[PDB]
Design an enzyme around this catalytic site. Structure first.
Site, mmCIF file in Angstrom:
data_model
loop_
_atom_site.group_PDB
_atom_site.id
_atom_site.type_symbol
_atom_site.label_atom_id
_atom_site.label_comp_id
_atom_site.label_asym_id
_atom_site.label_seq_id
_atom_site.Cartn_x
_atom_site.Cartn_y
_atom_site.Cartn_z
ATOM 1 N N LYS A 96 -24.486 -13.860 -9.246
ATOM 2 C CA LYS A 96 -25.153 -13.590 -7.961
ATOM 3 C C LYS A 96 -24.114 -13.606 -6.832
ATOM 4 O O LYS A 96 -23.468 -14.635 -6.601
ATOM 5 C CB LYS A 96 -26.290 -14.600 -7.698
ATOM 6 C CG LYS A 96 -27.158 -14.292 -6.470
ATOM 7 C CD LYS A 96 -28.321 -15.295 -6.364
ATOM 8 C CE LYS A 96 -29.237 -15.086 -5.185
ATOM 9 N NZ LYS A 96 -28.598 -15.459 -3.891
ATOM 10 N N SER A 124 -23.439 -18.106 -6.527
ATOM 11 C CA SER A 124 -24.212 -19.076 -7.307
ATOM 12 C C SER A 124 -23.609 -19.331 -8.700
ATOM 13 O O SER A 124 -23.092 -18.409 -9.342
ATOM 14 C CB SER A 124 -25.653 -18.589 -7.472
ATOM 15 O OG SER A 124 -26.441 -19.449 -8.282
ATOM 16 N N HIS A 174 -40.625 1.951 10.363
ATOM 17 C CA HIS A 174 -41.619 0.863 10.251
ATOM 18 C C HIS A 174 -41.521 0.210 8.858
ATOM 19 O O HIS A 174 -42.467 -0.449 8.428
ATOM 20 C CB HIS A 174 -43.076 1.353 10.493
ATOM 21 C CG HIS A 174 -43.304 2.122 11.758
ATOM 22 N ND1 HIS A 174 -43.909 1.540 12.858
ATOM 23 C CD2 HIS A 174 -43.106 3.432 12.018
ATOM 24 C CE1 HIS A 174 -44.034 2.503 13.759
ATOM 25 N NE2 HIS A 174 -43.562 3.656 13.305
ATOM 26 N N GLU A 194 -23.740 -11.765 7.059
ATOM 27 C CA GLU A 194 -24.239 -13.091 7.470
ATOM 28 C C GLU A 194 -23.356 -13.689 8.574
ATOM 29 O O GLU A 194 -23.880 -14.252 9.527
ATOM 30 C CB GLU A 194 -24.312 -14.066 6.282
ATOM 31 C CG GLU A 194 -25.587 -13.933 5.474
ATOM 32 C CD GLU A 194 -25.605 -14.605 4.111
ATOM 33 O OE1 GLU A 194 -24.879 -15.606 3.909
ATOM 34 O OE2 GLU A 194 -26.388 -14.145 3.252
#
Lengths: 459, 458, 459, 459
Positions: C316, C310, C179, C323
């Site tokens: 980054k 980035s 959860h 993805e």
């Protein structure tokens, strides 16, 4: 045959004649998945956006005019389709569309270099921007243009073809069908007015989604805060895009965080496209059933011949355009499920399903636009009604014996209906054959009670 | 009125006559969403599992025999359906099914208290267990039972009705239809053998998913490591369940982490149900179209009358069972999309979409089971064929020129079909009129090739 | 510029250098909908099938040996990929794939004409055939090959990469999460064994659908009766195809009417692909979350750097392969809905949604194959664990009080977890502070029960 | 225990105390499929419609006032919920909803009989009506009421709770997340303003579908022609329904054939509900991730405790309301696919998927209404932010070193970012520790450049 380029990660070998650089070449090697890249409309939207950004950066005195002019000239070439072979990155790339953003910046830098102007792909071409606000902006520009300039006029053309047939067939009486069983009379014009309303309601559905489909993220930068961009960058870019394209539906988003954290505008627009696919399925299925046969089907209408139907069965002609329409509709349903899936799975400041969502929504717009025009011109416009056959079945239907009840009784009316089916005769001829014309019912009274066109109650 | 109950979070007012306690009452107030709770099959599976867990804890000497006897007795009453009104928690509860697990534990504790046995809902009834392994175990027990004891026999009954029609109508020649257009002859029996194969392949699809649908998470406890349970708890519980249900398809999961982190077995089983719905749509659509009209339709067959269709249009009877079948198929398609959505969105050690996934898979099983039996008995069994009309349709198709391709070629055969339709003449006469009878094709060879039953090649 | 060709419907202007004829040109003008035609695998399967059909017609003495030799030679060039630019018909064509069947027949007739052999596209190249049995046969050949020769080895490569990490990280203890909340200890190896089983069950799912996916309609001709074909045409063609491809999964259909009236084998196979997409979503989501942050996330593992993420935020790096995997999974979900929609809408002797269903199933196979190999090689293989951070997380979870349930009970253990969190003290100290050490639980028993690696119970 | 009833097909045994008659009992035996019948809202809508029809038939002098008064009194009892146990017919009934229409007529006839008034279920209670115009009318009344009276106020309550939190947390600075990785600062208020806009856009989507969702088929009769009904029957019934309910969105359909041949209004409305489910998934997922932990998660916020989390792990509390929300969203997605499937498969004058489409659209309205109110009241209203923890991570982020570049250079700024992560210190403390405060940069200048709240650019 190759050259060396650089990025913050090191050296990259790039094909010598490619207008793209190191970051695009990395994306080529990282994502060989579908073998399909950005569509013409996506490349056009990226070119439009980069040109408008350079114009605003120049206007605000942030970018040297000679550099801005070189971006505007290069971006115009990209928007015109002169460099579509310079966008080799797969659709299934990084979820923000960073790779395709870098691809546009690098191609612009290489075009400008050929004219003797040195541009930094990030510092100059990506000035005041982020991939997180530019790729969804380009996606929403392309989706808004597809809705306004192509789909709505194609749907209007289909509506007009259906409405013209509804008027031609205003008095073409036929028997209605409910649950696929014999029902009371209708006109072929009334059914086609129904189809016309479905397409008209489709245009209304597309128009209703435009206030949110036209919302652009531009100016929100990396997280929606607008950090590293002028405060009015968004409103200025949108003002330039509207002046250049005439797409008045384009606007800055109501909320800059909602415009990047989610792609709900695409999910909404896909829902309208899916409803149109649902309407087109009904219209195309009814039309191919009406044209079924010629001898073992319904044989209500004749579709124009477009090509030989079978490689084995000679002389056979098939409803190829209703088939193309129902297949397109299935694709739109499928694409819709992929868009919703992508839409729900954003996280915090960014939804990273944009290239996949863009592919699917733009394909659904394209498929529906092209198949609606073909269906209108190569199928609907040339339909022929078998008028005499349609009237004969309506005049032979057991459903039309009910207005005889007040003259001969429901028991005798049921006997007329039974004999008519058995002898394959009209209700009128059966009433005469049973010797029911007399003082209780005259032939003028019979023709009045069995007037099938009057039963359809046409306007 | 009410009584006071308590949990680790505090006091809760519970209805006086309710067999549930504090945690069920919290769940009643937290989730008033759909107004629907667990089905009879879900309560049965939870009952069977709690009884089996008590039996194994007793065998391993972890639970006192009288405490275990009281759980087994209470769990048998739950599985029998005596306390279904004691399960009021909504389907849209905490994603692990913790609330429904505590509901079973509290109801068992209250039943046993009536017999003078004091059971702690957590420490005794939930001994060696977690909701993370028990709620998906009860779900997979219910789905495996629905597949084996109910759906497969219902589909077998439908297959047998379709195959019997395929045999009776073996020589009932008719015109074939492709793209909805007049094609070469077929028999009504050949089409029904096609429908029978679709249902037979449907049974094959259900049977192929059973090795993974039957996999139970029991023994894995909270995260799949089996912490706070004996090492063989899972294999021992499954053995008791197989002995009591007769379901040999029930087995321990191959990987205890995959069995709790994902519900992939339910997504897989739904895919088989979705394909059956796709097959049933084609069969039901063809049957309602064959019975269409009679005057404005195909009027090939007659469906048995099941209820009046219209008073305004006297004697109009509608294909009500094909309509029920295609609507059920639409619901199965919908439920399938909901199941896949929940199945993909697990996180780390637990998929928290089990009550929703359980609702949808068990409903799809129930809908297909019940509609297949009704379709077989109230529609398929009593279908009658309009034999003479069907033979006339077979003889009227212009595509009967197809077996002449080897004698006159495709191009000449196309000119025959088109001239026959334009002049409203038969294929036989058009072949004679176009002076095609000679060395390549005799009049006896033409009559032999144009026999519609022989052309159907039964 | 153009040349004149003809069919049973009349004359057609065809481009001078095109190897296609009249019926392909009609289809080019009838269906300009998506701008995309058949894939390389579909053209290969049509090539293989036409060659196999010519071989069997030759063996049965129905086609002259030189005519058969010319078809086999031309069909081998098509299957090899020499004439892919000679297949211009859109995917959204007549639902039986008649147009693409005539496209193969006409291209073979033109290639053979260059060698001085005259072939009739219908009478010779389409001998003993129909589009109704050949186009779904080529579709099922392509899907069976994609499943056996490409997808299963790619999934095996992914399974092996996941199982190797499960072995390397066997004792890498961490905190379990249910959860999204702090749970009892697990090992990173145990989670990866879970992911490996999901992929292993995925292979099992593909293999379970093969007895029906491999079923071919060849021999059934127009409606499934086999009219205008030899009685053993189907079994003989399948035998040639099995010998040439090595695909023993290829078989004659159990029922020749079901094989043409429905495409249920593609709906079934798509369901297995959809479940793999569901498994891949969970695996990719867990991996990107494990690599999240580092500062604002879980920072459990480190993903290999594949490209700059980035410029504005230096250093980054984003989880680009997870993805790509989750976007591919969304596309497979979408394609699955399109396939089921087409599969349900067959009518009588033929399902007319084959080109659309073929596009979607073959794309799903291709996407899953390519992304699984990239995910295994460019992401899974190079993952590194933050071992020390992970052990600290395992020791910090308050749920480590769970093995004390048999000694102090659930209610007392809950009071321990809550007091430990409120006073910012360890579970061990809270048990001591609450005076729980005695006969039921010694200090040595508490230290033994609180060992996080022992609590994970690794085999 | 039973009684004998009759219809045009013969004798039927009916339970002695049942208010339904022969046709309902036939439907009970024909459709035992789901074991679930019409919902309270559906029965209410059928009662409202029958009462309004009796009023209009009385007004036009077609039905005796004593008979009309008995229908109005009986229909009012049905609309109030006094006879819900008298509607036993399964949802999976005849596709037009004829059985449930007959069920309403028979129950009205039995109620009136108890008051000494004899009504013919067809001749009196179904006067000027058909099942084909009444069941979809009752469906669209129930769907319009569910949208206007229940969903929109529930969504408005959720919007207001989210907007109140957006205002409370206006200055609660935190670190942004893109691709799940560390990004530039945002506020918790900005994210919640994003969620608020998603719900506001949801209300706009529901409002946009109302002009077509409120369209009623009443007056169209069997095929849409209005045969056997007065010409103004539809406008008169709608006038009564609007006056009695206050539901101004109710209107006669623009086209009477489109209103019965299709249910496109339900497909359209489901698309809006599906988009809301997509928005709710994002909001609920972000909220449970923000509340994850307390020690191995993100621990950004604290959700209110609603119930003990685990049966085995004591003290653990789970995000049970975000779980209920995401499960409801999955159900809405599923129901949406069933609605579209039913919507596309109408034929000629009637779509026969109405009871199935009605079940799914009304359930989606109910689930979204109830879960939005619970989410607003039991979760959103009581959320608490870990303000100090959120600010500390934003002030320790390597992303905030970029405004230092114009003072110390990007090389030294990268070294500051590297040392800050290693020592787990703020960027500010690291700049001081590296001895960078001097003539080139003062501490006042440092606090200005590293002002994280100013970087979020809050309004």
């Amino acid at each position: 045959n190759y050259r060396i380029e650089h990025d913050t990660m090191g050296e990259v070998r790039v094909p010598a004649k490619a207008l793209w650089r190191a970051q695009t070449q990395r994306a080529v090697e990282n994502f060989p998945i579908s073998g399909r890249g950005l569509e013409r409309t996506q490349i056009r939207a990226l070119g439009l956006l980069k040109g408008a950004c350079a114009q605003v950066n120049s206007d605000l005195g942030l970018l040297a005019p000679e550099k801005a002019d070189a971006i505007i000239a290069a971006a115009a070439e990209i928007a015109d389709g002169q460099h579509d072979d310079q966008f080799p990155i797969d659709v299934f790339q990084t979820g923000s569309g960073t790779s395709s953003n870098m691809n546009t910046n690098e191609v612009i830098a290489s075009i400008a270099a050929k004219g003797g102007v040195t541009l930094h792909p990030n510092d100059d071409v990506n000035m005041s921007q982020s991939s997180n606000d530019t790729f969804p902006t380009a996606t929403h520009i392309a989706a808004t243009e597809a809705a306004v300039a192509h789909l709505i006029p194609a749907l209007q053309q289909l509506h007009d073809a259906l409405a013209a047939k509804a008027l031609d067939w205003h008095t073409v009486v036929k028997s209605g069908r409910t649950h696929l069983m014999d029902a009371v009379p209708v006109t072929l014009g009334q059914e086609f007015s129904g189809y016309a309303r479905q397409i008209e309601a489709g245009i209304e559905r597309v128009r209703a989604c435009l206030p949110r489909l036209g919302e652009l993220a531009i100016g929100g930068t990396a997280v929606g805060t607008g950090l590293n961009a002028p405060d009015d960058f968004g409103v200025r870019v949108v003002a330039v895009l509207v002046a250049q394209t005439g797409l008045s539906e384009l606007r800055t988003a109501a909320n800059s965080f909602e415009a990047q954290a989610a792609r709900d505008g695409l999910v909404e627009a896909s829902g309208a496209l899916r409803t149109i696919a649902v309407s087109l399925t009904k219209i195309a299925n009814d039309i191919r059933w009406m044209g079924s046969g010629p001898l073992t089907g319904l044989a209500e209408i004749q579709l124009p011949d477009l090509q030989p139907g079978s490689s084995i069965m000679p002389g056979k002609v098939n409803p190829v355009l209703p088939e193309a329409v129902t297949q397109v509709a299935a694709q739109v349903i499928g694409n819709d499920a992929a868009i919703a899936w992508g839409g729900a799975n954003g996280a915090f400041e960014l939804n990273v399903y944009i290239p996949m969502m863009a592919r699917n929504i733009l394909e659904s717009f394209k498929l529906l636009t092209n198949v609606s025009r073909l269906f209108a011109q190569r199928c609907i416009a040339g339909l022929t009604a078998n008028v005499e056959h349609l009237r004969r079945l309506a005049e032979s239907s057991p459903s039309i014996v009910t207005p005889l009840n007040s003259a001969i009784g429901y028991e005798e009316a049921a006997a007329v209906a039974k004999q008519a089916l058995k002898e394959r005769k009209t209700i009128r001829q059966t009433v005469i054959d049973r010797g029911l014309i007399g003082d209780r019912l005259s032939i003028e009274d019979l023709d009045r009670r069995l007037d099938v066109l009057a039963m359809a109650k046409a306007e």
